Amino acid sequence: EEKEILWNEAKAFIAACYQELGKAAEVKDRLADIKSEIDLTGSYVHTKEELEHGAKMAWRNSNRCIGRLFWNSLNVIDRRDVRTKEEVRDALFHHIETATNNGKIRPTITIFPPEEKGEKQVEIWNHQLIRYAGYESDGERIGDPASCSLTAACEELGWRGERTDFDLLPLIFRMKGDEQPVWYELPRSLVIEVPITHPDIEAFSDLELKWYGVPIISDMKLEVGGIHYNAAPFNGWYMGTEIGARNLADEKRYDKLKKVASVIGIAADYNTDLWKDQALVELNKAVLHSYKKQGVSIVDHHTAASQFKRFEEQAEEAGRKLTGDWTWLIPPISPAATHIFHRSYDNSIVKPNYFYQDKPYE
Amino acid sequence: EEKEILWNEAKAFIAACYQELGKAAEVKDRLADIKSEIDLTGSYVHTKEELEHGAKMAWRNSNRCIGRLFWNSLNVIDRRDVRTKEEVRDALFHHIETATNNGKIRPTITIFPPEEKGEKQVEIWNHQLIRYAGYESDGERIGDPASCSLTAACEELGWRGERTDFDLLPLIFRMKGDEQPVWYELPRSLVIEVPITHPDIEAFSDLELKWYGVPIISDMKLEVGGIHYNAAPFNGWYMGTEIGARNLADEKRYDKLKKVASVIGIAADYNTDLWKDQALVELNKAVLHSYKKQGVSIVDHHTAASQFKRFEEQAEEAGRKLTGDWTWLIPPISPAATHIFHRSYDNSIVKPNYFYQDKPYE
Ligand code: HEM
Ligand code: HEM
Ligand SMILES: CNc1cc(C)cc(CCc2cc(C#N)cc(CCc3cc(C)cc(N)n3)c2)n1
Ligand SMILES: CNc1cc(C)cc(CCc2cc(C#N)cc(CCc3cc(C)cc(N)n3)c2)n1
Ligand SMILES: [Cl-]
Ligand SMILES: [Cl-]
């Protein structure tokens, strides 16, 4: 029942939000205003304060995120005013610039107009605002396989990649009323990249690996008080294992472990040599070293787990239930060296939150 | 309802067991016999064939075990005939000898008389038949902290440990009718141990680490067709990470990572150096090397995961549902390098199975 689920979600959110903001006295009148507004318009508009706090709560409730200690310092940019594709493009360029902050990454979310009756106003096709293209033509793989379908969709639309292993995908999004998305090439001056080198092993540079500085997830829906912000890209800084144990290591991604084993001078022939484990450690050491040397924000998984322990402690002190997904919170290397591995977490979904949504292509 | 839950479990087990054994025709008459036997005695006795297959099914259903490919080759020793503490002691000594098999470890279970009306006939106090004692007297910790409470219980009973870091705990068990357990020192000729050395790093021997060859879990209950075998110790061979990433690495166990870091020549000062990860890899390489050199069975986590993949495939081919606990099946180092990490598992409990039971001390 559309309006009823909206009103119910609104009631719960407004009470909780205003409680946290010390505004519990204003809850009654605000709810009155909202109920009338829904009665007449079928929806309601968040105040700037509600929107900001809602986006922060949504991060705080993200069960899969180890980085939640810093939820309250999220930089929230309200772009509910955009109406044109140039305004969207410029807002996304601005997000990249302000989030990057010359390498001292600022966790940031830009919030675009929400869905009206399930009707999107802006529909972003990118998984992240900055990501590498992927290709496969008869056997040979180039670039990031995770981007293969989006890359093909872009090329259908007249974009053409250089077919290096690190082509930047264009921004691609569709406006309400348009049949086709538009795409815009990323200005390279906006995009920080870090070449991967090793602190002790000079030959590591032979692999010619690099990665981009800022992960800006752009395909999830932010839900706050029953309002669906389907277009609301957000970023943090990387935890090193995301690059070194996933993006560059996974067989279905860049698949670099055999090449790493070769440059660090170990055989990749016997499981019992633990060469994959050894290669993973050195690649992950290289990633952290390289970001630190360049002055680009990054966190290692041990430090991240320690920060998360403080998030747990803060939640208990504030009297808030803690929720988490153990399977995503443990790091993909040395998980048992973190406190996370040795406890359990309630995987209940609490709103506001960020949610998956269907891809508009494929 | 005691008898009814027994009869129901018996019906399900006998049908399934006889189906798998190609004996489905005999199900009807066997069930008749069983129902009469329960009617008169309050319980029933498994045939040797039922007991053997039941113990194998129980391993096959153990959601937390990565080693299940080899479920059908379990060596089942029927000791339902024991009545004296000397017979129990001798059976446990025999299990150690036959399971060890001069280093070519045989997965084995010895099954003692089952509970009658919840009344245990034999109650084993050990967690494993072979394990090291642990102590703490005013600040200083010696040996395995996981054994502290059992060690104290043994010493209450007149045992005294030498207070090395590797004292073998005695076998300790209680017979029905006795108020106190009895204990027996392990003959050292029965116990294989492996000194830990590193394939390339000579200084690794300075740590004076060793571990025992065979993990023989002795505190779980085997449940088959509603019969509760509370005393039924079982063993496999080790996966290397159990020793190198858990027993010797955990802060609440032997806690050796800083010492490992020192002997491999790296600083243990900065999280971003990933020294814990590097130390874990070298310690785990050392463990595998040392067992292999001595001719004691062991498996690495990559090979184990590959075997488990074949277990999954075999289950599907046989038309059996697969159950598993993802949180225990992933190895504690490089979990994302295994296929296990990238799929999900149904954690449903299926019987026959092995279950936890309350400790008789503490
Ligand atoms: C500040 C630095 C941050 C770090 C280091 C961090 C770390 C991570 C990591 C490691 C993951 C899991 C990735 C994986 O499993 O491979 C994750 C997931 C997630 N993070 Fe964070 N995060 C940060 C900031 C943020 C921010 C600012 C938000 C939103 C406002 C956010 C929301 C999420 C969400 C929604 C997921 C789950 C994504 C999914 O289901 O695919 N994080 N984070
Ligand atoms: C043949 C070699 C075997 C290997 C390599 C193996 C491997 C393992 C591993 C790695 C674990 C998890 C340990 C941890 O999380 O730290 C485990 C758990 C388990 N294994 Fe196996 N296993 C083997 C044989 C057996 C046998 C023969 C049985 C029983 C007949 C068995 C039953 C179990 C059970 C019940 C658990 C869970 C124990 C608990 O809940 O504490 N395994 N196995
Ligand atoms: C069990 N862990 C598990 C399981 C599955 C099935 C997927 C993933 C990874 C999901 C995922 C992939 C990619 C990429 N590329 C980026 C992300 C963004 C993660 C993220 C988001 C933000 C905002 C900051 C930050 N540092 N990191 C998530 N993990
Ligand atoms: C998430 N993984 C997780 C979580 C918790 C809370 C505990 C454990 C470990 C349990 C455990 C501890 C110790 C010892 N010492 C031996 C075992 C026996 C494991 C075992 C049993 C057998 C038969 C063979 C074999 N190779 N290994 C289990 N794992
Ligand atoms: Cl990423
Ligand atoms: Cl063990």
Task: Summarize this structure as a short list of keywords or feature phrases.
inhibitor; binds chloride ion; 3 domains; Bovine Endothelial Nitric Oxide Synthase Heme Domain, Chain: A,domain 3; globular; dimeric; homodimer; 14% strand; Nitric Oxide Synthase,Heme Domain, Chain A, domain 2; binds protoporphyrin IX containing FE; oxidoreductase; 3-stranded antiparallel beta sheet; 4-stranded mixed beta sheet; binds the ligand CNc1cc(C)cc(CCc2cc(C#N)cc(CCc3cc(C)cc(N)n3)c2)n1; 362 residues
The tally of strands of chain A reads 16
Rg result of chain A = 22 Å
Query: Distance between the terminal alpha carbons of chain A, to the nearest Å?
Result: 31 Å
CATH class placement of the largest domain in chain A:
Alpha Beta
The major sheet of chain A is characterized as: 4 strands, mixed
What small molecules are bound in this structure? Answer: protoporphyrin IX containing FE, ligand IVU, chloride ion
Task: Return the string of H and E elements of chain A.
Answer: HHHEHEEEEHEEEEEEEEEHHHEHHE
Described by the principal axes of the CA atoms, the overall outline of chain A is globular
Structural class of chain A: alpha+beta
CATH superfamily of the largest domain in chain A: Nitric Oxide Synthase, Chain A, domain 1
Helical percent range of chain A? 25-40%
- How are strands sequenced across the largest beta sheet of chain A? 1-2-13-10
| Overall structural domain count of chain A | 3
Strand content of chain A: 5-15%
CATH topology of the largest domain in chain A: Nitric Oxide Synthase, Chain A, domain 1
Number of helices of chain A: 10
What oligomeric state is this? Answer: homodimer
Organism (chains A, B): Bacillus subtilis (strain 168)
Family (chains A, B): Belongs to the NOS family. Bacterial NOS oxygenase subfamily.
Catalytic activity (chains A, B): 3 reduced [flavodoxin] + 2 L-arginine + 4 O2 = 3 oxidized [flavodoxin] + 2 L-citrulline + 2 nitric oxide + 4 H2O + 5 H(+)
Pfam families (chains A, B): NO_synthase
